[PDB]
Specification:
The complex is a heterotetramer, with two copies of chain A (676 residues) and two copies of chain C (207 residues). Chain A has 676 residues and is mainly α. Chain A contains 23 helices and twelve strands. In chain A, the strands form five sheets. In chain A, strands 5-7-8 form a three-stranded mixed β-sheet. Chain C is built from eleven helices and no strands. The chains are: A mainly alpha (676), C mainly alpha (207). Bound molecules: a molecule of 2 linked components (NAG-NAG) (2 copies), adenosine-5'-diphosphate (2 copies) and chloride ion (3 copies). One chloride ion (CL) binds at residues 148, 150-151, 415, 417-418 of chain A. Chain D: Keywords: Glycoprotein, Lysosome, Membrane, Osteopetrosis, Phosphoprotein, Signal, Transmembrane, Transmembrane helix.
Chain lengths: 676, 676, 207, 207
Amino acid sequence: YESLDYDNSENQLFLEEERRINHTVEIKRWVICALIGILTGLVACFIDIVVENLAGLKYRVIKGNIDKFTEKGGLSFSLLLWATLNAAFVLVGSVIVAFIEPVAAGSGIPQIKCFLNGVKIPHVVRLKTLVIKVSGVILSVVGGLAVGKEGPMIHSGSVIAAGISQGRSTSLKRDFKIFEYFRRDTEKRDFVSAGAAAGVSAAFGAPVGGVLFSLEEGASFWNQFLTWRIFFASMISTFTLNFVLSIYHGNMWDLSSPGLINFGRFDSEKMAYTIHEIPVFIAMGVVGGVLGAVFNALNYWLTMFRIRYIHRPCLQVIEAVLVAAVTATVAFVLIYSSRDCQPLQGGSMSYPLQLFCADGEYNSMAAAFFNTPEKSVVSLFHDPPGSYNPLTLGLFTLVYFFLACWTYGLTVSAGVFIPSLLIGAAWGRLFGISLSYLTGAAIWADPGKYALMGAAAQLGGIVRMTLSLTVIMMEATSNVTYGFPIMLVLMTAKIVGDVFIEGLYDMHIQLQSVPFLHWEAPVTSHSLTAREVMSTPVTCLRRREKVGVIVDVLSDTASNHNGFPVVEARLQGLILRSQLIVLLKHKVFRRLRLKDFRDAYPRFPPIQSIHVSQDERECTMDLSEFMNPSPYTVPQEASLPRVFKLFRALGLRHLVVVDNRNQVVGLVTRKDLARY
Amino acid sequence: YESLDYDNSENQLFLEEERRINHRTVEIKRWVICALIGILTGLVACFIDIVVENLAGLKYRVIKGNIDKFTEKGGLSFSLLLWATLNAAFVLVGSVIVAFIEPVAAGSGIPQIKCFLNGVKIPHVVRLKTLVIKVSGVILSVVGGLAVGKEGPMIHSGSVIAAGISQGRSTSLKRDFKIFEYFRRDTEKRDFVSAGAAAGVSAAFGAPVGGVLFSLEEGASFWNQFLTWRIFFASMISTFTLNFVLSIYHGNMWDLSSPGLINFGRFDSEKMAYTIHEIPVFIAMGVVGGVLGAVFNALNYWLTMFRIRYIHRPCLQVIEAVLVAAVTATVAFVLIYSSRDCQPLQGGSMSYPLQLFCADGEYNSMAAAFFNTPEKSVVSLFHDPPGSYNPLTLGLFTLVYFFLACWTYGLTVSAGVFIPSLLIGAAWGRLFGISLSYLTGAAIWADPGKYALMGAAAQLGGIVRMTLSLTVIMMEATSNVTYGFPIMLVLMTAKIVGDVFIEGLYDMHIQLQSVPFLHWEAPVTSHSLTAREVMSTPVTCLRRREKVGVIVDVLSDTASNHNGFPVVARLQGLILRSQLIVLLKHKVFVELRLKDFRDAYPRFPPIQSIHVSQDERECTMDLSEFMNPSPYTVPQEASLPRVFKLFRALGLRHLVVVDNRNQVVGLVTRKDLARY
Amino acid sequence: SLPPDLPDLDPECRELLLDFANSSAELTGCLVRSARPVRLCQTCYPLFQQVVSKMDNISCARSLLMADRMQIVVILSEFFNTTWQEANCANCLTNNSEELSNSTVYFLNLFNHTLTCFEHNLNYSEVCKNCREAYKTLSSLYSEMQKMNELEHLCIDVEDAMNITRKLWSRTFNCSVPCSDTVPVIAVSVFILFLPVVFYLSSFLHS
Amino acid sequence: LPPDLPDLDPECRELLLDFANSSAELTGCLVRSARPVRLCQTCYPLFQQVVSKMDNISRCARSLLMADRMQIVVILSEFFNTTWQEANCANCLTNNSEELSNSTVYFLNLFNHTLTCFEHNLNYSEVCKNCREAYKTLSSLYSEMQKMNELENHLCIDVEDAMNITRKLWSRTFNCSVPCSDTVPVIAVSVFILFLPVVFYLSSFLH
Ligand SMILES: *[C@@H]1O[C@H](CO)[C@@H](O[C@@H]2O[C@H](CO)[C@@H](O)[C@H](O)[C@H]2NC(C)=O)[C@H](O)[C@H]1NC(C)=O
Ligand SMILES: *[C@@H]1O[C@H](CO)[C@@H](O[C@@H]2O[C@H](CO)[C@@H](O)[C@H](O)[C@H]2NC(C)=O)[C@H](O)[C@H]1NC(C)=O
Ligand SMILES: Nc1ncnc2c1ncn2[C@@H]1O[C@H](COP(=O)(O)OP(=O)(O)O)[C@@H](O)[C@H]1O
Ligand SMILES: Nc1ncnc2c1ncn2[C@@H]1O[C@H](COP(=O)(O)OP(=O)(O)O)[C@@H](O)[C@H]1O
Ligand SMILES: [Cl-]
Ligand SMILES: [Cl-]
Ligand SMILES: [Cl-]
């Protein structure tokens, strides 16, 4: 896969550009980040509007026919209607994913992590890839797959961020003369950070969780005013979402909906915890880690079954259809065979099914389905004690853990968070019901509290991120002292989950061969210096060379490198492939400046598409004006936690290794920091 | 002012010491030390809070019982002399112990620790004597009735606890305590001081992520995941410890309704909701607060410059603080004596109802504004029902307390500036609410409990120009996350409108002592300086196999006292002077397991003592196993924005400059780099 | 000869307090005498309105009301608004609390007819059968009014009447349609749960 | 007829009608003896018998309390306990709510003593005379009882309104006060201390 530079070339044309602008560009970055925030908020609000409306239109068919047959007979026509509606919406929303572009599958997070880490997965930022995924989640959550829409907002934020930063649409083949300074990929990597952070803050309503998400990946030096612009974009995105949802719901000046999911507020004082139940919270994290390991192992062998055998696109479409049909029949087995009814009190169902009940009561398993999963997650956090049948939650949890697991690796744009939080609030609630059975209904056996800790338990178990997940769960709940049990639970669940299998997102990274970088060394490798790591032959140039050597180096037809040093064997600089391509086009053997090096900045033209082999490829070549004069340089006896620290924290992609005297041996290029 | 070394040696004794622990113990030691830092900082916070509120309750009970006996008799002026004495007694005790013993405990501890995390080691900053004196002084000054806050010195208290207990050493008691024996380099000390400062911020204001982002603003390092997650760990420990212990002091334990020393309450109650049209009102309040901060800092700057030039005897600046306490007593009693309004107890709003002239059921209004903690007044300038103050009295308190807090900063006491800034800002920011209620009728959106908060944020951003950590503190301490958007607009506005006039209060008292203090970026209005300007071209370099007659030449010259030397001419590494004396005391000659380097680690033995003999001036000392084999060698032609973001991001205090020849020309230290 | 409101009250508004008290004490008699047979909104909808009119006569405004910290009259009237706005007695009222609505009294008349149909057919052989029409038309009118509500809960009278009807129809009768409908749904359920293993095996074998 | 589906029980009619024969009396007691605050010394036997009539039926309770979605008997006792905890008449009652308490029955007489002295001393120049040695001990007794309840932990509403009338009638509408012109000896000190810092600054600036 393709790398991504982050350090600028610092060539003398960029110094000329520094002198020309320094006779007012930072002010552009603020309004670009503000637009990224506004657009991500509007996309989140548009998804909320259309997913509420279509699923609201969908169940009024299904309730209006289950209630039609239940006094005569013949529910099999209603079940076939409900399976046909689910399979139809999932067919429409998945045929655009397997055939058109196979990269919008699942949440964006396994691609956004690798992009912030610098791997250009070959379709991440594309207007087509956006509108597949924006219209995929709408046609998939309404399809009745057991998924949650809060997941794939990070990719929408990143796509919109890298799109509107450039003043150019390559998908429309038109241009603008607006933001010529920002086609340079030092900047473009940092705008994707702002878009992902704003996608997080518009997802879960926790705007530091965006910041300490997008600071975790892209683990670079503390670029301060970048970080402050990221927090700026995060706050604007959550305010735009809250404002438009509160003018759509009525009561314009009651900004009550911060994110897509809203956990409530925990100032009810039955939710209050003290020290005498702190080692209970360690026990929930162990169970969360165990069930997350079971989840990830089942999904892992499922994907190992799916890559080798189901790789034709139409097979994948038939697979995605024949899960939504099975899901509705499983749900209707559970609803049709349920033997408990509870009447309505306030808004708790909004599509109640008086299936077999006593005409004022309603089917409780029908209430656990037939909802947005957001409403069930919020209800489990805040329903009063004594408001659930434990058999009901047991059946719902036990089927839902597999339906969450079986529906992850499919070719649908969807998340995993609200499935993970719904499982975690599901089995966590049972642990708070049984403690009201042993303690004789004490006050610290509050089952609305133990649903909250099970949610963070399962979510830390399945995906192993902390400090981007502790910060959200502090800030969505809006109770500050809840971070301490959540910190304990997340530490516990990550440690107990790492002794079985890796994290789900790192799993789906490594199952498709990404040259990815972790936070540190593999284990230690302090003895393993830079001697054993560098590549032994060096394909290097000279400043007093002849073109034709350029043609043979760029047309190796066996290697396809992108970084080339230049020496006299004394190291002078590091010339890229793409800059050397642009030097090959125009007559070099004066007018060349930085805008000539931003001509169609992604996807430059390859070497076969330039015929310069008759008069050119026979004379000299000057790249003394066109070179990075101070590339970062380690000696070969540098230990690996000094080599990996300099490489990862700067966003380098070619780290030249130079011995005692200035002579070049080897050039570390990111594959040999992933193989260890 | 001499920098410390956050960079690692990585010589041969470091590579040996990397063995025998990888053939996993030290990580759990790091976690347990961070947990103890959190617990001890919480205990020190509970010590300060309980002792201060008990002593202040004693003092104001004595004074309040005094005046009512002397009301109708005619001895009011003789009661003024008691309270002018009772201020003057504690401040005298609270300044004598500060001036003569440790003058570094003056003001807040925040500029010293802010200079610490940049690498500069102010001399007496982290001794245990400094802890004892600063804690005793902040108790004696907050009880001493000055216009001070006690959340200032909680940063230096936590930092001193963290730099102390992560040693297993005191050295003010001459003891050894060989327990940890590995956390005795300046890298580990800087990391644990970061943890202790974050726990101090979280114990002060009750927001943990404010603490983490504060300790990541300063020390703008490379990103380090397990470090920042441990920092957050110690932060949560300190918050929960403080919360738990102040909870069981009130005999309840079952709510945990106090996370920090100052606690703001619940901003959700629908009278606090804000609308999108009053965003320019918030910008205007940011402008207003951003110029009274400039007035505050400027009048302090011409006041502090006078005290430095003249009042610099340690026995004469003590007499100053006594008169400051006397003026606070006199001015407050004059303002209380001449307030023509009375206002009844609203159900425990005052807690010390001092009736002077009232109608025997009502009490004085201004005696509620004084005769309290500033913290209860700030929380009660929030949260009141509208129509609960007299703007003459409340504005009259504001018009005095601003100058009293401007005048009580550079004294020889341990003080704060946060809560005086929050008491000023919540006062006139409240007054803007009454005027909006006067010019709009009984408008709902002009609720002055909302505008009293924006003014607090405006003033606090104006006085101490700090944005990112302050925004998260103000967004989390209110426990409402939609307020971060107006607050961050306020803080951006106030920082810009403030930096167009003056430096900033924390940075100004840093600059007045001429410490180097590398800023966040380079001064971007400096052009492409290469390294051939900002370096020191006469170099005192050493050799590998060198006769010891130039070692003692260069260690002892009394006119060019340096520290750190490169060894060659080519380059082979860098040797430290603090490491090179241990090569002389233990007599390492050709004619030690990195533990003699670390036993007598702080306050390295100065080379005057050793007395090498004259025949050991031609003997040969080989230091090839002691130098850092990987220094950071920027080229000559590297630009200045490259060499800053290595010297500042990585914790360096040397930087070799070399060429294509790898000749050593110049060197970049902090003094040679913060002079532009 | 003390100034007014300080020793006692003036007799000029003491009469207003007294005949407010005489009227307001009767409303408790409505609420508790007409409690468990829940005839609430149709009994003291006159007695509640005259209390509101007596609130207007005392609105000696600052002399009575806003001269004490435990405002007896004001918290009593606030309790009457609270009891009023949870029963939702306006749904029983017509337009401006003059009389009842025709829909609700139509419902109540049909309700008493349904109870007479319950009483005449009195071993629940001919009780479940030959009485189901009344339960269906009464629940039909209930769901009709309940759907009528939302463009504009209900009155506590009609809602507790329908609670009586549903509790009687559900238990002590068990007049339940058996609805033998199991076997087709089981056939379709096994028919669809067996499709995925067919899909997985036909994917594995075509290899 | 099934039990408690259409109507009441014979041993639950009296269990409902006793409460309605008393709660009207108590609500009328509050509003009749409301605004001249005589409440804690009038309505406490009526309140305690309302409590007892709640208890003797609370011990068909599930057929009355938990039988309706608007629990009329529960929300009415809830409001009375709300008033009785807000008024805190338990301060004004001796040991088992039987008689008035020991000190407060004498405080009410010193209220009446002070009113008789106000009336007999009836340009309020001589009314400031002849009663300041009784107003002072009245306020002393009030503050002594308030410190008594401070040591146990708003007081009983009966005595707080009496002291509120007394303070609202002594301090204003009489304007009885003492000037105590101690302004100039304060200014004799409050200027001298403020004159110290200019001396301290200009002393060291010259030396
Ligand atoms: C003393 O009397 C005054 C009036 O004479 C009371 O003031 C009223 O208090 C209530 C609630 O406490 C407010 O709703 C009214 O608006 C107030 N009156 C006015 C004119 O503003 C005061 O509360 C009494 N104090 C006590 C302890 O009973
Ligand atoms: C219908 O009647 C039942 C009782 O037959 C009511 O159930 C009571 O509900 C209240 C709160 O709604 C609870 O406090 C009681 O404990 C319940 N008692 C019993 C015996 O169940 C039910 O609420 C009524 N529903 C409506 C709409 O009036
Ligand atoms: N000129 C070169 N000399 C030596 N090794 C090279 C050269 N170019 C590339 N490599 C090696 O080839 C591997 C892949 O490099 P390449 O794919 O060109 O880089 P990128 O990751 O930027 O696509 C790495 O191990 C790298 O060190
Ligand atoms: N080896 C050296 N060669 C030249 N200048 C040096 C050398 N070492 C230190 N200096 C200079 O000495 C001054 C102070 O250095 P030093 O005492 O080591 O302070 P610091 O605490 O910043 O390291 C600076 O101007 C620095 O550049
Ligand atoms: Cl999701
Ligand atoms: Cl402070
Ligand atoms: Cl401070």
